[PDB]
Each structure stands twice: as structure tokens, then as C-alpha cells.
Point group: C6
Chain length 219, copies 6
């Protein structure tokens, strides 16, 4: 990554064994459960595009996902190039060239060029731009591997309400409902999919009940 | 987080793999037992709002709790906005804008803006303000998942007094009795809920007995 | 804690995940065996009162002990207040207020105030003062949970002398004999509680035998 | 490795126990699965040639591979010497000599000489040059140990499409297909090797289907 | 311990969780096998007397040994006091007092006083002086717990020579033979205690055989 | 070890718990398999002679080897003394004395003297000189414990060629064949010791076949 030293200048630092191991292990253990994404984001704090490729490349399984990811990155790169075409021909000697899509994705740029962009005044944030494309791709993957429609999360006759809600919001998260839909469903689908005894209790609370109030009600 | 370097200026540092892992593991292992809260607080020492979202977002289970938490945070944010309304319209060029509720919660502010607020002279402590809202929400969750009323913690006929007290104060902690009530119960409910042999011993000690004195008495 | 940087000024540092985990694990694994105390002391090297509460609060079991501890801390605080009463009324603007008992224990003081006291010239060592109260309380707990009187540590007919001595001094340590009594018992209770064959060997060595000499004798 | 300190000068640092252990463990656990290569590259960030030999030499098994690697390194070294012959005879006193192939590979150069080259202005990047030769050799090894031709990866009658794709792209990666061939096969061999039910679904989508579209189609 | 910072002044640093844990674990796992001693020495690199007490005090078992250790430390302290008596009466204001035995052992000196002595120009090396006393005591313990006389290490009829030698020198190390005796026994007791077939082979090599030569001979 | 700080002066640093543990564990797990040597070398990067003794002394088993090692070190020391005799009599006040063999091996020199030599301008590299003697000794040990002659590594009738080569070069490495012999055997003993089916395939390839070519041939 690029970090501030103890004296406040922005410099490159090797990606650490702990970072490298953390990411590989979270993928091994969690696959593409939605919480992997914010872990990815945090593990790649200050990453260069080189570092982001490193992390992605160190993944051994899930090659279908990695290939889908590549496709997403290629799509974003191509859009970047549509918006920000670069001058063909020789670079001004000693000067910084403009990044293309593939430069941002780290496949046609050097670490040195990446460092130059990221520490320019002002910075051309190639790491942050690439991380956004990657996360966009990872979110498609999370949705793809979400095994269950919210429509099939229904409370079991002896299933504690709490356990049901946990299933319900876990599914909505993977299915990638917006936060509006998540805040909203408390008044609707959550109640509909509840079991008969809880549904009656909830129906009776009236509208505007918090999730806390619903969960207390059916405890 | 934001930290002082070795030279005393306040700078941003990436959240560490060790921090990230610690929090995820404490939630996996302890759920919402009350001691998770002070662990959360300590793991988020110097956190930006970004870091606080990171920690919360890396949690994979307990989505009912996470949704309740969101609701609590939205309530606090809305109160913040009631107290501290912000000027609509364009920002003074190069100047610091005032934070809204959602800015404090990190959903509408950048890391850069968060850093600007937290390192201003004097600091606008958005991380500390958000951490308070979060802890408020986590405390509601701890109380919600507390499985047992203090009324049902009664000493078993062969249960060592010590083991009973441990159950009793563990329950009071989750049920979230004030410290007055915790200091107070030594003279009352603790004695009432004791078994017959210990109750008689304790009844006889008289009032004003320390907890130490009670435990020695029924050892 | 408060630490010297690489440039020799005293600054606050976040308590580390490793510290936090170490303490929680030592309590889980050792409970209140006497060696937990010096581990506590070393893990809290340079702690603020905030850090000391953190460590104590992260403990999930042993709530009877934690409540006894609170009682001890309240007793010390009340004595502090007897010795060092503080001026009622408004603080001199921009100046440092004097700490009360509860300020030392971290329940009514901020981290900022704690830092101010601890880094004042000369320091008002609120962390060290509070750690003493805590250790005083933890020592009462160690004595309370010591399961065995020294009177009941007697050498078994086939128990190697060494194993007996280990039991004997382990018990004395938990029972909290002074170092005089520990140095002294080599001439008395240690011999009395030895088995018949070793007792005769030891009786015959005469007075002034080192522990080394006793153990060699009954090897 | 060679690193920038906190003050921006390039200095040698001992290879860490964590780095050393990470590499040994990744080889023990993954052998020459393709993801070992980018892990090697990242673990050797800033390595001198000495460090690169260290890592390779600490490997205990896989000696056939290590000997093949040596052969590849000797081939590259010999080509380096063809391109960059060095002056025979005595070195200019106090001056830097030019590196030969074996100097780059660390077998005939000292750590001091390596440091001199790598921190020269401009740097003679002997570590980076050697790492390229090594990776070239490791890629030959990955291809050699790839146990399965892409032609034999065919979807099973009850094998979920996703699991099939994962096998398919895992194999292509080890077999070392170019990225063109990887992007291309989505329209061809991937479809041909699919089972009858999925093949029909895919045949019907038409050309230009993304991998995402194929996987959704056969979900 | 006391360490040099990044700027070359000698300062106190908290003993680390890793150090604390390392020592406790080596004692748990190895007891007083002789290799514990050099581990102790290395783990206490730069220790103050406070740190040395910490390490010793964190040990939970082996209290017979810890009490023997105390006795040894008291003996050394008393000898220190014989050699270096200190002036009774009030200290010169603001000046450094001379250490007594108990000051060196950390029981009557503060951390501040210890730091003052150890960082004086020239240093009064109280940590190093105390570590010597401790090691002296630990060596007595290693000898005490050495379970086997060298006289009873004899090569078994089917025991490989190598395995026998390993037993032999392991025993000599615990029994604490000087290095002369260790270098010497190769010509004597090692041969005598060998089995009949190896003894004849060795007898025939003649005098002056290296240990390497003996081991090759009986391989 | 001796390290450069963040400001470029050469200073002593305590050997770390991680280093100490790494070495002990590699010996426990790998004994004297040849890859232990380069691990030793890397773990002792920047070691003083004190540090090198520490590492060797922390080893608990393998005392036959440790005694052989001592003998090798004594031989080298005695040769050092033959080449570099030192002036008898009193040292020039405040000046640096010349190291003897035993000074280099750390048995008659202090840490201070070692630091003085290693940080002199120019350095008298006592750590590097001693590490060479140690490695010389460790290589004798690796050869001694190599359980199998290369002559007895023959490919089994159903043993995959790859597995055979791995055995073959593992054995050659422990037996300590030169790199000439390792590069050479591909044309000879490797083929001779191959099974009948592979031998014929290899015989037919002709001379000058790479190891890669041989392994592809018999795959
Ligand atoms: O090595 C790479 C880096 C990056 C990558 C790697 C592993 C998984 C996902 C994407 C990538 C992105 C787009 C592309 O066309 C090719 C590549 N190849
Ligand atoms: O991503 C977030 C951050 C934060 C959060 C995350 C995980 C659990 C709990 C709260 C949050 C808070 C309020 C809100 O309306 C939305 C969010 N969404
Ligand atoms: O949170 C705290 C901190 C401290 C504490 C915590 C956990 C166990 C023991 C003592 C404490 C001390 C005295 C008191 O009256 C109240 C408290 N409450
Ligand atoms: O020790 C070495 C370093 C390097 C190496 C080591 C372990 C595996 C692979 C290559 C190497 C490269 C070429 C060569 O002819 C000899 C060597 N010997
Ligand atoms: O706490 C201590 C420190 C030291 C110590 C501790 C644990 C084991 C061994 C010795 C010690 C040394 C001599 C003495 O008389 C008393 C003590 N008490
Ligand atoms: O303590 C030591 C250090 C060194 C050492 C230790 C452990 C194994 C091997 C050699 C050593 C070297 C030569 C010698 O005559 C004596 C010693 N004794």
C-alpha cells in the first residue's frame, strides 16, 4: 500500500504477510458471503492496483467468480476509456502519462507509475478507482451465490422469532436489497412470512412498530 | 483510526488485520454477552466513522441485531439533526462543512471529511459521537438477548454460593441493572434467592454485610 | 496506555488487541490463581484508569469477584476522598481540576483529564494509584477462591517430596502467607506435614537446613 | 529486503520470521497450485537476491521442482551474460562492478554488492531481475504439475454449473492459458464441455453471453 | 525493559504480551530442562529488576523451585550487602542512592530508581546483576530436577548409537558437567557405557577420535 | 542482533520472542533436514555471537549434534588463532582489543565487546565469522544424519517419476553433492536408477535432455 510514514510523506510499503494471509483465509472460510466485501475493502486500505491484483490473484478456488470479476473490471475499464481518452504518441520526458483503464487495473502500469499517480499533488487515485470497480464486481458475485430468495424465508412453527429474523435479514443482505427495502420490510414481508402465532401478535401491534418492538412482541 | 505518529501530529492509519479479526472473533465466540461492548469500545479506540462501519459490516451473523442497530443509529442521527441543523446550499470553497447525522454515521461523509473534522482545532469528534450512538444500540441488543430474568436466578440446594452469585451478577449485568441496584441487591434479592441453609446464615449476619462477608459466610 | 514515543514525549496509545486478548485469556484459563495478579500488573503497564476499566470490563465470567472488586475500589476511593478533599465550585478556566476517588477509578473522569494528570509535571499518577486499589481487591479475591488450608496439605505415603512441596507452597501463595512465613515454614509446618519416612530424614538434618537441602534429603 | 525507513533512505532489513514462515507454509499447503506464484511475488516484495535464495532454499520438499528451477535460472543467467558481458580484470578501487548472471542470482555476489546495485542512482534492480527469472521458472513448474487437461473437464450430469466452471477455470489457470483464451472459451469449449441440459440452455442464449449470463442461465 | 529508541537514548519500555506469554509457555512445556535457562536469559534481554520479578511471578506451578530460587537470591543479596554496604541516613536531595541487595532484586526499589541506576553514566547494571543471581538459582534447580545420573545412561543392545549419545549428553547437560568434562568423556565414560558391539568398534579406533568419528564408526 | 535504526546508525536490538520461537520450532519439526540450515542463517540475520549462542543453546534435544558442533567450532577457533594471534598483556586504555577464536564464538567476549567489533569502522564482523563456523558444523551434522545413500534411491515399478526425482534430489541434497554433481546426474545416475519403462523412454531421448524434458517424457 501507500502510507504516511512517522514524518508525514506518502510512501509505498510492502503488503504484509498478515494482510495476505487474512484475505486468503477469509475467502477460504466465508466464500462470498456479503461480509467478505467490507473485509476486502478494509484489508486493502491504501492499496495500489498492484496490491489489489495480488490479493485477487492469491485466491486459489472460486475461479468462476474470478473470471466473472475480470469481465466486470474489463467493462469498467472500457467505460473509463470512453470518458478519459489518453493522447497517443510519446510521453513528455520525465513527465507523468495519463492512466488508461488497464493502467488503473494494474495490468499495463508499473508500480512506479501507480505510485506516481497516487502521490501526485493532487492525487490521481488509481487504487481507489480500481477498488470501486472490484467491489462492483464482488457485489455481483455475492448476489449470484446468494442461495435463497427472500420469498422462501418463512418462520418455522417452533422457530424462535429471533432466529427467523436473522435468516431473513441475512438473505436480504446477500440478495442485496437497498437499505429502503430493509427498513421497509419490517412493516410487510417480515410480518407475512412470520408463523401464525407471531403473525397475529404482530398484526395486532399496529403500524410503525420498530424491529425491536416486533422482536420483543414475539419473544 | 486516527493516531499520533512518533512526532505528535494526528494522522489516519489503516485499521489493522489484527483489529479486524479480533472484533469478528469476539462476536463469533460471545455474541451479545455484555462484555462484548467494552471490547468493541477498546477495539475501536481512535476509530473514524468509516472504521466503525467497517467493524459493524464485517459481522456475518446476527443480522436482526444489525438491523435493530441501524434503527437506533437512525434515531440518534435524526436527533442530532434536530439539535444541529446545517446550512443548505454551496460550501465555502476550501472550507469545512458542518456534519449532519448521516455524516457522523459515515454513510454520507468521506474519509477525508471525517479526518478533517476529527483533526480540526478544536476537533469535531465524529468518531466519538458515532461510537456513543453505536454503543447505545448495542446495549439495547445486549438487554434484548439476555435470556433470563433476575427473578429466576435462585441458588440450587447443592449449588455452591459462589456459583450462584456468579449467575446472579452475570444476569443483572445483561438485564442492565444500574450500579445502584447492583450495590443494593446484596442486602435483598441476593439473600431472598439464596437457598434455605445459606439464607439463614445470611439473615443472621445482619444488615450492612459486604458481598465478601456474605460469600465467606456461605462458603 | 501512556508511553514515550521514539522522541521522548509522553503520549496516549490505544490499548492493543494483543493486550486485550492476553488478559481475557489469562482469566479464562487461570481464574484467580495468584499468578494472575502479576500478569494483570504487567499487562497494564502504563495504563490509564480507562484502560484498567477496559481490562476489568472485558471479563465475561466471574461476576461475583467483579462485584467484590467494585466494593473494594469504592472503599479505597472513599478513603482517597477522606485524605484529599477537592474544592467544590467552578474550575479555573483552562486549568487542571483535582482528582476525586471516582476520578482515579475512571468513572467520573474523561480520558483527557486522565492524560492531563498522568503527564503533568510532576505527574499525578492516577493510573498507578488505581492499579494499587485494583490489585488490593484482586488479592482479596485470590484469598477467597484459594480452595485449601495449608493445614490440609500433607505429603502422601508415595508422593514424591518435590510434588508435596509444590502443593505446599502453591497453597501458601493463594492463602497469602507473608514472605516471613514462607521462609519460616521450611523449619516447621513443612516438616510436620511431611510423610513418616521423609519426616524422620528431615528431623535428623537438624535446624537451619535450606529448602534445597530438605529436598535433596528426601529425594 | 531493501525498504525505505521512516525518513525516506533505502536500507536493508532482515527478512522476518513471519515472511520466512509464510512462504514455507504456503508451499507445504498448496505445492505448485498457480496461486502460489503471486503469493511468492508478494512475500518477496523488496527482496535482495540473497532473500530470494533464502526463500527458495528454505523449501524442504519438492526437490525435483527446485532442480528444474535452477536449470531455468541458469538458462536466464546465461542469456543475461550474452546481452551484458562484463569487463574482465581488476575493479576500479572503491567502485561498483557490473553484475553477471550469477551475481543477479546471488550465488557469486555478496549482500553488500547486491545492496550497492539496488540502491545505486539509478538502481540496478538485481532483485527484480532475479525475481522475474524465478517466476518464469515457477510458471514452468505450475504447468508441469497441472494434473488435468482442459479437454477432460466436463460437467457431470448432476454437477452444478458453478462447480463445473470453477473446475474449468481452475484447470485453465494451471495449464496457463492466456487471458485471451480465458475470455474466449466462454463462447466455446465451456459450452461444449457442459452437460446436455445446460448445453441446450446455453446454445439457446446466443453468442456474446457474459459468463455471468451463462451461470445465471444454468443456475 | 530498557531499550534504545530510534534516536539512541535509553528508555523504559513495557514488557510485551509476547514476551510474557513466551516465558510462561516455555515453563509450562519444558519445566526445568536446561534449555529453559538460555531462553530465560534471552527473553529478559534489557530487563529491569521489576521485569525479572514479573517473569518469575507469572509462573503458576513449580512453587518449590520458586521458593528455592528466593533462597538463592537472598543469599546473593546478602553477599552483595557484605561487599557494598550503603550509607545509612537521609539521601542527598535529588541525588541517586546506592543500591542494596534487595534493591537489586527489585523488592525495595522502585521502577524509577531502577531506571536511574541502569541509565546512569556509567550504568549501575542492576538488571544484569540480578539476572546473574537468578540464573545461578535456576541452575541449582536444573541440577536438582535432573532425573538421571550419567552413570545410568548406557547404550541399549538395539539402541542406535546416535540415540544413546543424545541421551548421554542430554543427561550431562542437566547434571551440569563442565565443558572440560563434556569434551573429555568422548574418550571415556561414553565408550564404557556403549553396548558390546559398539564398544569394540570404538576401542579399536584408538585415542583422539572426534565425536563425529565415533558416531560414524558405530553407525 | 545489530540493526540500523530508522535514522541509519548501527545499534543492538534484543533478539525477539518470534525469532527465538521460530528457531526452536524448526529444529523440533525438521531436525537436521538440509533446509534447516538456510532457515538458521536467515533467522540469525544480523546476529551477534551472543545471539548465535542463544539460538544454539535454546535447542533442547539433539545433544550429540550440539556436542559435535562445539567440536567443529573449537577446530575453527583454533585455526583462527593460528592465523590471527593477539598481543598478550594489558589493553591500551579505552581501546578495542583484538578478537581471539573464543571471542568470536562468544564464550570469552562480552556483548559490549562484540558490539564494538561489529560496529567499528570498518567492522570486524565477528557475528558473520562465527556464523560461518556454525554453518560449517551444521553441514557436517546434516550429512551425518542423512539416512540414505543416493545409490539406494531407485524408482519403484509403480512410483510416479516425479515422486522418484523428489526422493533422488532430496537425498543428494542431504548427502551434500556439489551443484556440479546435481546438474550432472540428470544424464547418469538419475537415468540408471529409473524403472525399466521410464529408463527406456529416457535412454531414447538422447543426451542433453533437461530435467524438465526427462520429467515430461516419463509423465
Ligand atoms: O491478473 C490479473 C489481475 C486482475 C484479476 C486477477 C484475479 C481475479 C480477478 C482479476 C485482472 C482484471 C481484468 C483482466 O482482464 C485481467 C486480470 N488479470
Ligand atoms: O453500512 C451501513 C453502516 C451502518 C451499519 C452497518 C452494519 C450494522 C449496523 C449499522 C448503518 C447505520 C444506519 C443506517 O441507516 C445504515 C447503515 N449502513
Ligand atoms: O465500569 C466500572 C469500572 C470499575 C469495574 C469494572 C469491572 C469490574 C470491576 C470494576 C468500577 C469500580 C467501582 C464501581 O463502583 C463501579 C465500577 N464500574
Ligand atoms: O542455492 C542456490 C540458490 C538458487 C536456488 C536455490 C533453491 C532452489 C532453486 C534455486 C540457485 C539457482 C541456480 C543455481 O545453479 C544454483 C542455485 N543454488
Ligand atoms: O516477589 C518476589 C520477587 C522475587 C521472586 C519471585 C518469584 C520467584 C522467585 C523470586 C523474590 C526474591 C527473593 C525474595 O526473598 C522474595 C521475592 N519475592
Ligand atoms: O555455550 C556454548 C556456546 C557454543 C554452543 C552452544 C550450543 C551448541 C553448540 C555450541 C559453544 C561452542 C564451542 C564450545 O567449546 C563451547 C560452547 N558453549
Amino acid at each position: 500500500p501507500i502510507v504516511q510514514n512517522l514524518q508525514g510523506q506518502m510512501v509505498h510499503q510492502c503488503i504484509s504477510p498478515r494482510t495476505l494471509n487474512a484475505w486468503v483465509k477469509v475467502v477460504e472460510e466465508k466464500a462470498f458471503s456479503p461480509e467478505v466485501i467490507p473485509m476486502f475493502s478494509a484489508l486493502s486500505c491504501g492499496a495500489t492496483p498492484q496490491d489489489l491484483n495480488t490479493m485477487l490473484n492469491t485466491v486459489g478456488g472460486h475461479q468462476a467468480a474470478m473470471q466473472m470479476l475480470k469481465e466486470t473490471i474489463n467493462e469498467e475499464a472500457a467505460e473509463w476509456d470512453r470518458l478519459h481518452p489518453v493522447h497517443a504518441g510519446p510521453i513528455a520526458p520525465g513527465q507523468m502519462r495519463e492512466p488508461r483503464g488497464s493502467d488503473i487495473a494494474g495490468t499495463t502500469s508499473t508500480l512506479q507509475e501507480q505510485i506516481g499517480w497516487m502521490t501526485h499533488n493532487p492525487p490521481i487515485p488509481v487504487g481507489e478507482i480500481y477498488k470501486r470497480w472490484i467491489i462492483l464486481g464482488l457485489n455481483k458475485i455475492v448476489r449470484m451465490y446468494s442461495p435463497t430468495s427472500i420469498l422462501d424465508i418463512r418462520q418455522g412453527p417452533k422457530e424462535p422469532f429471533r432466529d427467523y429474523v436473522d435468516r431473513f435479514y441475512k438473505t436480504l443482505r446477500a440478495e442485496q436489497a437497498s437499505q429502503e427495502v430493509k427498513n421497509a420490510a419490517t412493516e410487510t414481508l417480515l410480518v407475512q412470512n412470520a408463523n401464525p402465532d407471531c403473525k397475529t401478535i404482530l398484526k395486532a401491534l399496529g403500524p410503525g412498530a420498530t424491529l425491536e418492538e416486533m422482536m420483543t412482541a414475539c419473544q
